[PDB]
Amino acid sequence: IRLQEDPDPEDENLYEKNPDSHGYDKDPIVDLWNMRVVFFFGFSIVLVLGSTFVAYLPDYRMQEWARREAERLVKYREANGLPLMESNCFDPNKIQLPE
Amino acid sequence: MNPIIYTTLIMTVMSGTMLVMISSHWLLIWIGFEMNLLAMIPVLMKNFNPRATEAATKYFLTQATASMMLMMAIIINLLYSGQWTITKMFNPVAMTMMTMALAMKLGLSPFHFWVPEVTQGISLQAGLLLLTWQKLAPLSVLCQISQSINPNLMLTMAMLSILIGGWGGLNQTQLRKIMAYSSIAHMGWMTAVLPYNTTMTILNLLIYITMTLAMFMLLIHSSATTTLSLSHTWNKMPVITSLMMVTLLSMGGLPPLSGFMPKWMIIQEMTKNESIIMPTLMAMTALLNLYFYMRLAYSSSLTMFPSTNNMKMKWQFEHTKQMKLLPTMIVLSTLVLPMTPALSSLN
Amino acid sequence: NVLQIVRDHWVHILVPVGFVFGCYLDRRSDEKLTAFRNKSLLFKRELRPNEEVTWK
Amino acid sequence: SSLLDLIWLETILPKTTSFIQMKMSIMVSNQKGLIKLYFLSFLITIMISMTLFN
Amino acid sequence: LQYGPLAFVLGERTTRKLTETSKVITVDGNICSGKGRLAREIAEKLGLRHFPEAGIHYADSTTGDGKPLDVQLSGNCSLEKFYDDPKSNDGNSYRLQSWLYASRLLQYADALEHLLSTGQGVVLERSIYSDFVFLEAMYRQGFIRKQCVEHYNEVKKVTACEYLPPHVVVYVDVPVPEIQSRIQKKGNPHEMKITAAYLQDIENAYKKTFLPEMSEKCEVLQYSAREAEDAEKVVEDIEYLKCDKGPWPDQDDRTFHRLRMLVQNKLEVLNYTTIPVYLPEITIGAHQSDRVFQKFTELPGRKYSPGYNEDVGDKWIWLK
Amino acid sequence: MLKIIIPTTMLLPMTWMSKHNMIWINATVHSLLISLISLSLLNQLGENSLNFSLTFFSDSLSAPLLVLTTWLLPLMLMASQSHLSKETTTRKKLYITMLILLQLFLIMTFTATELILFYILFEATLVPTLIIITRWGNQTERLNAGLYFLFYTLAGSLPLLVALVYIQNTTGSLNFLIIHYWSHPLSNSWSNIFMWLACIMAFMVKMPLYGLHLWLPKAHVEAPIAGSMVLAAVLLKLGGYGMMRITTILNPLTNYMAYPFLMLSMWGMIMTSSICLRQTDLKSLIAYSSVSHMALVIVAIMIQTPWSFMGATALMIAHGLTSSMLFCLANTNYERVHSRTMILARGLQTLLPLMATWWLVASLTNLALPPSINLIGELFIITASFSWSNITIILMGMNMMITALYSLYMLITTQRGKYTHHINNIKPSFTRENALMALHILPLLLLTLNPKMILGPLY
Amino acid sequence: ARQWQPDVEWAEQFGGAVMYPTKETAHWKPPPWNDVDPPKDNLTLNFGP
Amino acid sequence: MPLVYMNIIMAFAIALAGLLMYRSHLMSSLLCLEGMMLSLFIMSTLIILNTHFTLANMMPIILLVFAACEAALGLSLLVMVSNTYGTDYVQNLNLLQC
Numbered sequence A: 001i002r003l004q005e006d007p008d009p010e011d012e013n014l015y016e017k018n019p020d021s022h023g024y025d026k027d028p029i030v031d032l033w034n035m036r037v038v039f040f041f042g043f044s045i046v047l048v049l050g051s052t053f054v055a056y057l058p059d060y061r062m063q064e065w066a067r068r069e070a071e072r073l074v075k076y077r078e079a080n081g082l083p084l085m086e087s088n089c090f091d092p093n094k095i096q097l098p099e
Numbered sequence B: 001m002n003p004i005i006y007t008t009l010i011m012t013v014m015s016g017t018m019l020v021m022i023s024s025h026w027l028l029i030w031i032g033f034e035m036n037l038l039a040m041i042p043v044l045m046k047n048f049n050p051r052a053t054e055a056a057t058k059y060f061l062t063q064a065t066a067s068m069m070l071m072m073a074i075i076i077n078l079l080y081s082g083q084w085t086i087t088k089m090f091n092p093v094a095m096t097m098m099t100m101a102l103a104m105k106l107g108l109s110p111f112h113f114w115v116p117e118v119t120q121g122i123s124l125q126a127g128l129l130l131l132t133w134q135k136l137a138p139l140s141v142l143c144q145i146s147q148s149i150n151p152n153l154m155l156t157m158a159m160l161s162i163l164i165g166g167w168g169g170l171n172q173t174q175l176r177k178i179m180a181y182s183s184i185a186h187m188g189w190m191t192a193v194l195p196y197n198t199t200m201t202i203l204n205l206l207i208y209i210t211m212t213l214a215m216f217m218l219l220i221h222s223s224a225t226t227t228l229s230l231s232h233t234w235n236k237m238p239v240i241t242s243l244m245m246v247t248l249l250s251m252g253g254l255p256p257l258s259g260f261m262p263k264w265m266i267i268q269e270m271t272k273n274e275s276i277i278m279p280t281l282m283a284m285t286a287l288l289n290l291y292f293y294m295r296l297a298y299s300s301s302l303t304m305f306p307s308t309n310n311m312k313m314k315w316q317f318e319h320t321k322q323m324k325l326l327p328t329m330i331v332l333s334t335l336v337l338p339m340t341p342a343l344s345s346l347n
Numbered sequence C: 001n002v003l004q005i006v007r008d009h010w011v012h013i014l015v016p017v018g019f020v021f022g023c024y025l026d027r028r029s030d031e032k033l034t035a036f037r038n039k040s041l042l043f044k045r046e047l048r049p050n051e052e053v054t055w056k
Numbered sequence D: 001s002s003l004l005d006l007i008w009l010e011t012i013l014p015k016t017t018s019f020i021q022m023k024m025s026i027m028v029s030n031q032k033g034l035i036k037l038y039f040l041s042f043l044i045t046i047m048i049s050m051t052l053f054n
Numbered sequence E: 001l002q003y004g005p006l007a008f009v010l011g012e013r014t015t016r017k018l019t020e021t022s023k024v025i026t027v028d029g030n031i032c033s034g035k036g037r038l039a040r041e042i043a044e045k046l047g048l049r050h051f052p053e054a055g056i057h058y059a060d061s062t063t064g065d066g067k068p069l070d071v072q073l074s075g076n077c078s079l080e081k082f083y084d085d086p087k088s089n090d091g092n093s094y095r096l097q098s099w100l101y102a103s104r105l106l107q108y109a110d111a112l113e114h115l116l117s118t119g120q121g122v123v124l125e126r127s128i129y130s131d132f133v134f135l136e137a138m139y140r141q142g143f144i145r146k147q148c149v150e151h152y153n154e155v156k157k158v159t160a161c162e163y164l165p166p167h168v169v170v171y172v173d174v175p176v177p178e179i180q181s182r183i184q185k186k187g188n189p190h191e192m193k194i195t196a197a198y199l200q201d202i203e204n205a206y207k208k209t210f211l212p213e214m215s216e217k218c219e220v221l222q223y224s225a226r227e228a229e230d231a232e233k234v235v236e237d238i239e240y241l242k243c244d245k246g247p248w249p250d251q252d253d254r255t256f257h258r259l260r261m262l263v264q265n266k267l268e269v270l271n272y273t274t275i276p277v278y279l280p281e282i283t284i285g286a287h288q289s290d291r292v293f294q295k296f297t298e299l300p301g302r303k304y305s306p307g308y309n310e311d312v313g314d315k316w317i318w319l320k
Numbered sequence F: 001m002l003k004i005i006i007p008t009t010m011l012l013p014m015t016w017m018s019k020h021n022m023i024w025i026n027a028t029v030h031s032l033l034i035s036l037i038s039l040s041l042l043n044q045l046g047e048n049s050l051n052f053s054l055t056f057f058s059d060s061l062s063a064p065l066l067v068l069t070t071w072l073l074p075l076m077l078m079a080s081q082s083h084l085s086k087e088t089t090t091r092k093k094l095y096i097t098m099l100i101l102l103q104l105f106l107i108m109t110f111t112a113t114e115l116i117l118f119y120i121l122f123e124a125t126l127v128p129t130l131i132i133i134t135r136w137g138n139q140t141e142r143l144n145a146g147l148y149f150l151f152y153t154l155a156g157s158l159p160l161l162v163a164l165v166y167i168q169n170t171t172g173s174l175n176f177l178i179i180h181y182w183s184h185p186l187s188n189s190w191s192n193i194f195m196w197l198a199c200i201m202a203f204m205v206k207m208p209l210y211g212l213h214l215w216l217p218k219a220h221v222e223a224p225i226a227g228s229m230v231l232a233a234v235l236l237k238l239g240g241y242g243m244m245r246i247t248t249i250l251n252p253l254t255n256y257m258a259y260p261f262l263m264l265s266m267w268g269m270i271m272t273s274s275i276c277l278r279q280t281d282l283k284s285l286i287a288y289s290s291v292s293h294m295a296l297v298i299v300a301i302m303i304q305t306p307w308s309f310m311g312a313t314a315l316m317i318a319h320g321l322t323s324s325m326l327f328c329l330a331n332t333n334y335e336r337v338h339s340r341t342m343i344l345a346r347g348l349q350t351l352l353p354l355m356a357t358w359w360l361v362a363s364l365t366n367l368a369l370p371p372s373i374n375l376i377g378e379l380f381i382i383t384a385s386f387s388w389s390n391i392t393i394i395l396m397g398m399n400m401m402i403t404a405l406y407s408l409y410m411l412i413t414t415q416r417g418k419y420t421h422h423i424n425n426i427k428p429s430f431t432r433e434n435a436l437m438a439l440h441i442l443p444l445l446l447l448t449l450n451p452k453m454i455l456g457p458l459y
Numbered sequence G: 001a002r003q004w005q006p007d008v009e010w011a012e013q014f015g016g017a018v019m020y021p022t023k024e025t026a027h028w029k030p031p032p033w034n035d036v037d038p039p040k041d042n043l044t045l046n047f048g049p
Numbered sequence H: 001m002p003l004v005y006m007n008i009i010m011a012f013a014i015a016l017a018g019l020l021m022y023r024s025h026l027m028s029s030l031l032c033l034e035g036m037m038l039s040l041f042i043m044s045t046l047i048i049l050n051t052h053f054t055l056a057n058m059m060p061i062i063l064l065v066f067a068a069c070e071a072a073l074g075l076s077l078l079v080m081v082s083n084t085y086g087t088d089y090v091q092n093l094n095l096l097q098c
């Protein structure tokens, strides 16, 4: 021997002292309420409410706005015979090349 | 030692340093240095033993040689300029002699051996006072004469100090020698930033002094002078071990602690002047200091070393003497990073 | 026992009051960035008859 | 697993650097604390600073 | 206020309070003798304060409530087990010896503090200077090891180099057969299990080492049992002896101030009793140390400082 | 962002003032509430980010990471409940405090608007992780793991600090919006090469990159369950977020300096998958799988195409969730038998059916079973790499095959076969463990249903 | 089944004279606990004729 | 500068070199330390008298006083070391190590 050391204790089983244990705490009431709050808050509140909130988040990415603008521009372009997509993004009149 | 004599000697050391910092005359500055050394020697030799006597003898020899070199530099400067006012020195040889003398007084490499030797020889309070005050004064002189400092020599000595401190701290086991090498490395950082921003020099001085005070006072509180002696502290007062761990983390420059602010500001100031290699090497070399800090923190806070049997009696009894400003120094050494722009006030 | 309930469950208001304080601080910070309110080229607009600020 | 991860990737960065730092620490701190020796070192440093620094 | 440099500056000098009877009369003696009765008689007649022999629950007594603590929390050793199985493999013999040495060091510090703070002399039944006889007796019989002896010597040196020497080895010289007869008459089985060789080794250690060692420092007054019955003769001999023995004549006010500062701080007194020497007999594992410290903190009036324990009836905590 | 930052700094005093038996309940409930509050950051714009103030801003890249961190905190709390039953009240409160501080630092790191504040917080995350590992690890190698982790990170990141201060001095500001609008091309010179090396190498060591990755097995194997969960899921994504942020100012030099890192990352995928094939430790297998996935993310970021950033973000989120679930399952098996050897315990499908189901689902998500976001990100990265060059398809295919091989190998080894006869302490699975696995797995399927929320700002 | 903590071997590794022992360092010895090294120790006169 | 200043500076340098090169004794080190002060006094008084710096004539006296006080301190330390060890050899000052 080299030290006055405690022996390694045997691991305790929560099911021995409480067959209805949820694995949260060794106190039955505290374990039950920990399980209840975890399940309620996490599953119900977070999952369901956050999922429906994200599903019905407003269209701030302007996907539908972009689609409507594209439809309007396509209609105007093909009604007047103009090309659907312009050749250049900017105006060559405003662009001054170095020469 | 009588308490009146002890406080008189402490006040004499402080008065010598104040005379050095307020004098505009080289003769008066030299007088202040002489008075500081003369009153400092008995403080080192307070607890009488052969190790303390040897440390005091080595310290006296080193400081006397440095004072002779400083007076020679003063005389040489007077020969070519006829001026006693402390300003930009008018002779390169005199400036080199003054720089070497002040480096010897501070402990910069290759004038560093006496720092761990004396620190191990003397007790904790003596080491604290030594480091703090005896680095406070020559740094003031250097800041006054900064504009004539040779950058090549100053930066060479600073980098050597950083490297030597890192390696010595890596190899040492004694707490006082570890503190001495930490002091060497931090002085290297300060003198590296000195030729560019004395404000950054003063900021590093203040942060280093705060952290060193916190660490030394924690060591005095735990009454530990070795690694294994400190390894028993967790079984008597685990709060002190955790405070020491956070102080050690701060001294290593880890963000978001107070120790990162001096390194950060010094790196910024040096890179403003188109210097990148020196800040990069200085930042990479601090990893050795952080390594031996972490190794010391493993033995005291993050693990549980075996204890003894009389520690039960230790538990039964209670600490009596109260340290002054220990919580304030602990807080200021770990939680002042969001207050960095106060360096303008320090300016 | 009502005091004991308060003495044990008073820590459950810290996070809600912190959330309220955070919302208040966010609004107070937003009130400091009104340099270009109703001044951008894209959203410049005449104010309504009963209105003083486009947004708060 | 063995040749690259456990041997050579460990040898290049962390082990070589650690060995170099350990050797340098031993070399730096192997001093015997002799005032004559390190004062002679002080003299050599003084001469070098006076001569090879312009 | 508490003694310190400010009190010394103000003028609280130790030599002012010292008198002729301000003497640390340690009374060194042997096992199961009339030393305890003799010490009590000497203390009353000379007006000195008597300290009962130091022990585990003496160390437990001075702190907090005077009631002793559990052996697990304090000491972790027993004398009965040493009597029952002197050569047990758990190191209880040397653990008990080291704990008893620490207790005696604490008691000597308390006696010095009382003497230097009140001027009254103190009578100790046994001191740290005579404690090595039990260690030598254990080592001769083979109860403890050479490493244990070396650790004890190191601790004794570094902890007793500071304090002033004792005053008298009142060696109540009782022959070993008479000691055995007294032990048998007393009737305690654990001490009845004491062998004769162990008792002889203590007497050999006293007479060959401790008696010659303390003769140089101070006077030694040896008495038999019948002589020790007459305490008046012992008191008369104590009052008669006068010389320049010991460092007490050359003790100064500054030295007394330093000694008082040392002895009023118990953690500084018990500083080197826990040096990091990892003998299996005294070393405690990390897990056991943690658990025992947790229990000690769970003790009623020991979680905080003495003035800040509400469970034992401390009020005005928020203004203190 | 203060509406999310302040509730964590209120979690701290609540934890320290709560009763001894209510700390876990309070921490879990309020962490879930904070996660619900942080769900509002998913309402991002299409053109510019959300600029709350001069200090904090949220983007389509920052929002999913913040949600992931706020969701990951309560799961770590549950795991800590699992493995810290016999700890004292003060030490349990300290553990919860470390977790809370780590979450707060991660939130501020993800929402920081300047590179220097980002660096300060991203380095501040080191302290709580190191303390957790080296203090609550179970084996001797935890000290060595902490040293390796800390020094790898710092050796990577110090030149990043030097480069950042140099960039601020040269340009004027480190604000991300300014350095994006005022970005200028980087010339091909040695100084620019070394600045690129500083920044990229810092984030690659954090990532990690193959050859700079040994700290990852060392730290993940020896860390406690909560430490492993936070190390694999969130702390590995700091490098990816930084690279996706710092590469704005490194073009066009990134087109020339990316070759060594691309080759390293692809061959590292191959090598780490092969290592996973022959691992005797389950945690090491999970760690090397994490390394392979992060190497794939590195490839995506380095090729730097609009289809590669979306895949990178999706793969980061998916890998974080999957690795957290795998570590939780491995920790349950370890706590049952007190050993990390994989072949020690077998027949766990016979002994524990529901855990076998959880293992099956986690291993299917690991091997990128469609239409999971793991596969979405991997497929986007593969398509971008194919556009980059036409042999990356070969490398990705062999990597995918080996990934499926080792995932199903660990599944078959742990769950299928004949149970070990002498192991008679296999108690039924706890409701806490089952709920932990369910809370890990359900958000993955919900994000599969709605994938546009984790595809980054280039969607 | 419980967290590993340092033992006597670890403490002895950390409790030498210096880390990384060599020949000279092994020849060295640790300093005394109280930093007081043991000491290493009248005039006669024949007068008259 | 004339050659007298050169000789004084050379003497100071020689004294400094002698101090930095110990042979056996600490007393010789103190002697070499005192020679440097003598050279400094000579140099200072020559410089001050040459330039007619009237108010500076008091500086050499102060220098001499302070250096003699330092010499007394060094002698006290030397005699303490000699009483401790038996000889004034610098070889005995090796308990503390770097």
Ligand SMILES: CCCCCCCCCCCCCCCCC[C@@H](O)O[C@H](CO[C@H](O)CCCCCCCCCCCCCCC)COP(=O)(O)OCC[N+](C)(C)C
Pocket: A046, A047, A050, A051, A052, A054, A055, A056, F039, F064, F067, F068, F071, F317, F443, F446, F447, F449, F450, F454
């Ligand atoms: C039964 C077997 C199941 C397993 C096998 C799967 C087999 C297929 C099962 C399919 C079941 C679902 C089919 C019906 C789906 C109906 C809901 C769906 O249509 O809505 C989705 C929406 O689902 C949600 O968006 C999913 C929410 C995902 C986020 C949940 C987060 C919860 C907190 C957890 C945090 C985790 C952090 C992870 C990083 C973020 C898609 O968006 P969208 O159709 O257009 O919304 C319509 C509303 N509009 C028209 C106004 C736009």
Ligand SMILES: Nc1ncnc2c1ncn2[C@@H]1O[C@H](COP(=O)(O)OP(=O)(O)O)[C@@H](O)[C@H]1O
Pocket: E030, E031, E032, E033, E034, E035, E036, E053, E079, E096, E097, E100, E101, E131, E134, E135, E191
């Ligand atoms: N240092 C020690 N080591 C071991 N045992 C000791 C030590 N000091 C005292 N004891 C024990 O304490 C007991 C004290 O008994 P004692 O007071 O002499 O009896 P009485 O009161 O009859 O004189 C003795 O039996 C002795 O064994």
